[PDB]
C-alpha cells in the first residue's frame, strides 16, 4: 500500500534512523561539502518526509525516493565548480540520472584522516550536545567511506554511543576510551574490507558463485529450514547483494528492510533463535539476522551417499538439473557441518561435480562415483590440521611472537615480496589468529575463514600492479576455491640469492624509545624481515641470537643513562656482529 513510499519509510524507520540514514546518503554523494550542507538537505527532506505523513495526497509525495533525493542532489549551485562533471547528471532522466549519481561517487576521495580531538574534549562536546557529535562523525565517517552499508554505519554510530558513555566516567578515560575506538576503527574498516570483498568477488566469480556460497552460509545459519525456503532467500539474498554491491543505498536498504520483514514473516520455517530479534524496531531485525547464531541442526540426519552415492539415478537426477541437484547437495552438506568454512563446503561440492562430470561419460557410472566422499577426507582435514597447529602455536607463543613466527616462516616462503607487504599480511594473520583462535574448534573455522579472505585479499591487492613473483601472481589468480591451498602449498625459494646489505637498512636512531609500541614493534618486525631477507639461510637459533642482541642494544641503550648516541656508536657493531653471526 502507501501512496508514498518516503512516508511508508519514515513511519517503519523512525525519525533517527530517517535522519541518520538520510544524512548518510547525501554524505556520500556529496563527499566535499560540508556538515551544514548534509544537515540543511536532511532537514528539508525530513520535513517534506513528513508533510507526506500527514497526508499521502500531498503535491510530489507519489514521486518515487530516487526522484526526490536526485533533485535535492541537483538543488545545490555549486555542483558543477566542486564536483564538476556531476552536475551533468541532473540534465539525464531520473533512471540513468541515477545511474550517473551513482558512478560519480568518489571511491579515492583523497580526504585527510581525521583528526581525532582530545579525550576531555570528545566527551566534553559528546556531553553538552550528543546528537550533533554523533551525526558529525557519522558524516565524517560517511563521507569517508562510500558504497559503505548506512544502517551498519548506524550501529556502528550507536556502538560508539556506548562507548563514550561507559568511558566519559572511568578514573582515567583515556585507557579506557582510545582501545574501543580503536577496535571500532578496526571493526569499521575490516567490515568495509569483507563488503569489498564480497562485491569484487561477485564481479569476478559470477553470480551463480555467490548463489552456492549463499545456499551453503544460510543452509549452516538454518539446517531446519527447507530447501525451497534457502532457494528463496538465496534469490532476495542474491538481489540485495547485487544491488546493495552495486553502490545504490536506496535499494540496498529498502531490500534489506524488505528481506528481514519476510524471515521474520516466516521464522517458523527458518529458525527458531529469530524469536528475540524479530521484536525489535526493523532496522535491527537485519542486523540481528545478520549476527544471529545458528540454529540447531535436526536431531540425527542421515547420510548423503543413500541419495548422492548409492542410488542409481544420479547421473540422471543430476543431467536432468545440474545447478538444483547440485544446490540439494550444497544444502543438506551445508546443514550438516557449521564447523566447516563457506569455500570448504564449495570445494567438496565442486568436486562432486567434477567427479559426476568424469563418470557420468564413462561406461559404468555407479563402479565410477562410488568414492567420491572419499575425496573429501583431505580437503576438510587439511585446514583443519592448520587452524589446530596455527591456534596451538598462538595459544602457546602469544601474539607478537606468532606474528614473528609467520613473518620468518612466510619470509622464508616468498623472499621477493616486498617487506611492508610481509609485515601488514604478518600481523593481519596474527590478528585474526587472536581473534578465531580463542573459540572453540567447532567455531573457528568460519571467523578464520571470513578473516583470512580479507588478509590475502590485501596480499593480492598489494601484489597487483606491483608483481614481485610469479606464484604469488598465480595463487592471486586461481579460482576462489583454489586461492587457500595454493597459498597454504607454498614451498621454501631456494633460488633466491640473498640481498644486498644495504648500510640504511639497518639503521635505528633514540626515536625508537620514544615511538609507540605499535611502530616499535613495526620497526623490530621490519628489521626482522630485512635480517631474512638478508641472510635466508639464516637458522631459528641465529636469528634469535641477532633478535636477541638488537633487542639488548635497544633495551641496554635506552635503558642506559643520558646516552642519544649509543644507537650510532653501538648500531655499528651490532651491524658487524650481524654480518658475522650469520656469515
Known amino acids: 500500500a502507501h501512496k508514498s513510499e518516503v512516508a511508508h519509510r519514515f513511519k517503519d524507520l523512525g525519525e533517527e534512523n530517517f535522519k541518520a540514514l538520510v544524512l548518510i546518503a547525501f554524505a556520500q554523494y556529496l563527499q566535499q561539502c560540508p556538515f551544514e550542507d548534509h544537515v540543511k538537505l536532511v532537514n528539508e527532506v525530513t520535513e517534506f518526509a513528513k508533510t507526506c505523513v500527514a497526508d499521502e495526497s500531498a503535491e510530489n509525495c507519489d514521486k518515487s525516493l530516487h526522484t526526490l533525493f536526485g533533485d535535492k542532489l541537483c538543488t545545490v549551485a555549486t555542483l558543477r565548480e566542486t564536483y564538476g562533471e556531476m552536475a551533468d547528471c541532473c540534465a539525464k532522466q531520473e533512471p540513468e ?12 576521495p583523497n ?3 581525521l583528526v581525532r580531538p582530545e579525550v576531555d574534549v570528545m566527551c566534553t562536546a559528546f ?7 554523533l551525526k558529525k562523525y557519522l558524516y565524517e565517517i560517511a563521507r569517508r567511506h562510500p558504497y559503505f552499508y548506512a544502517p551498519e554505519l548506524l550501529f556502528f554510530a ?5 562507548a563514550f558513555t561507559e568511558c566519559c566516567q572511568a578514573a582515567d578515560k583515556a585507557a579506557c576510551l582510545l582501545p574501543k575506538l580503536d577496535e571500532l576503527r578496526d571493526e569499521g574498516k575490516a567490515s568495509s574490507a569483507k563488503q569489498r570483498l564480497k562485491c569484487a568477488s561477485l564481479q569476478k566469480f559470477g553470480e551463480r558463485a555467490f548463489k552456492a556460497w549463499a545456499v551453503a552460509r544460510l543452509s549452516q545459519r538454518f539446517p531446519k529450514a527447507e530447501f525451497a525456503e534457502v532457494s528463496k532467500l538465496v534469490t532476495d539474498l542474491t538481489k540485495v547483494h547485487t544491488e546493495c554491491c552495486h553502490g545504490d543505498l536506496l535499494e540496498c536498504a529498502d531490500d534489506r528492510a524488505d528481506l528481514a520483514k519476510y524471515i521474520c514473516e516466516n521464522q517458523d520455517s527458518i529458525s527458531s533463535k529469530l524469536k528475540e530479534c524479530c521484536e525489535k524496531p526493523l532496522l535491527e531485525k537485519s542486523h540481528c539476522i545478520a549476527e544471529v547464531e545458528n540454529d540447531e541442526m535436526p536431531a540425527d540426519l542421515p547420510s548423503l551417499a543413500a541419495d548422492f552415492v548409492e542410488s542409481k539415478d544420479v547421473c540422471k537426477n543430476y543431467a536432468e ?3 538444483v541437484f547440485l544446490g540439494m547437495f550444497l544444502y543438506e552438506y551445508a546443514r550438516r557441518h557449521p564447523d566447516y568454512s563457506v569455500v570448504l563446503l564449495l570445494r567438496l561440492a565442486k568436486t562432486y561435480e567434477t567427479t559426476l562430470e568424469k563418470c ?10 562410488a568414492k567420491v566422499f572419499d575425496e573429501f577426507k583431505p580437503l576438510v582435514e587439511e585446514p583443519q590440521n592448520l587452524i589446530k597447529q596455527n591456534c596451538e602455536l598462538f595459544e602457546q607463543l602469544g601474539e607478537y611472537k606468532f606474528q614473528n613466527a609467520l613473518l620468518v616462516r612466510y619470509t622464508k616462503k616468498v623472499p621477493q615480496v616486498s617487506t611492508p607487504t610481509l609485515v601488514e599480511v604478518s600481523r593481519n594473520l596474527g590478528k585474526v589468529g587472536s581473534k578465531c583462535c580463542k573459540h572453540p574448534e567447532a ?6 575463514e571470513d578473516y583470512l579472505s580479507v588478509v590475502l585479499n590485501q596480499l593480492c591487492v598489494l601484489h597487483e600492479k606491483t608483481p614481485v613473483s610469479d606464484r604469488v601472481t598465480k595463487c592471486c589468480t586461481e579460482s576462489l576455491v583454489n586461492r587457500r591451498p595454493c597459498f597454504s602449498a607454498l614451498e621454501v625459494d631456494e633460488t633466491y640469492v640473498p640481498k644486498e646489505f644495504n648500510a640504511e637498512t639497518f639503521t635505528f636512531h633514540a626515536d625508537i624509545c620514544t615511538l609507540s609500541e605499535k611502530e616499535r614493534q613495526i620497526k623490530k618486525q621490519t628489521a626482522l624481515v630485512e635480517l631474512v631477507k638478508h641472510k635466508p639461510k639464516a637458522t631459528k637459533e641465529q636469528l634469535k641470537a641477532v633478535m636477541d642482541d638488537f633487542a639488548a642494544f635497544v633495551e641496554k641503550c635506552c635503558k642506559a643513562d643520558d646516552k642519544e648516541t649509543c644507537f650510532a656508536e653501538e648500531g655499528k657493531k651490532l651491524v658487524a656482529a650481524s654480518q658475522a653471526a650469520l656469515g
Open 127 to 133: 556531553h553538552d550536545n550528543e546528537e550533533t557529535f
Open 97 to 108: 540520472r541515477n545511474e550517473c549519481f551513482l558512478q560519480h561517487k568518489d571511491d579515492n
Open 111 to 113: 580526504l585527510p584522516r
Open 158 to 162: 550507536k556502538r560508539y554511543k556506548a
Open 443 to 448: 567455531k573457528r573455522m568460519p571467523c578464520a
Open 321 to 323: 538439473a545440474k545447478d
Open 360 to 369: 557420468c561419460a564413462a561406461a559404468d557410472p555407479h563402479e565410477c562415483y
